[PDB]
């Protein structure tokens, strides 16, 4: 999650706090996951080989 989030605390009652996103700065690219294209292709190749049996 490239964003630099800023957690903010809200006192909703005696002793109880609610943690809220007050501000968001930094890299605003959407959260993502990277899987190596070469490694995933050869892993599906192994899965397919064992799946044709």
């Amino acid at each position: 999650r490239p964003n630099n989030n800023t957690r903010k605390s809200i006192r909703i009652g005696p002793g109880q706090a609610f943690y809220a996103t007050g501000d968001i700065i930094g890299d605003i690219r959407q959260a993502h996951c990277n899987v190596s294209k070469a490694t995933w292709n050869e892993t599906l190749g192994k899965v397919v080989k064992q799946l044709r049996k």
């Binding site: 501000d23 968001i24 700065i25 930094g26 890299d27 605003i28 690219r29």
Partner: peptide, 11 residues
Amino acid sequence: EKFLIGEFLTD
């Protein structure tokens, strides 16, 4: 004030 460079947001 937040200024948006190409992909980065700054205070």
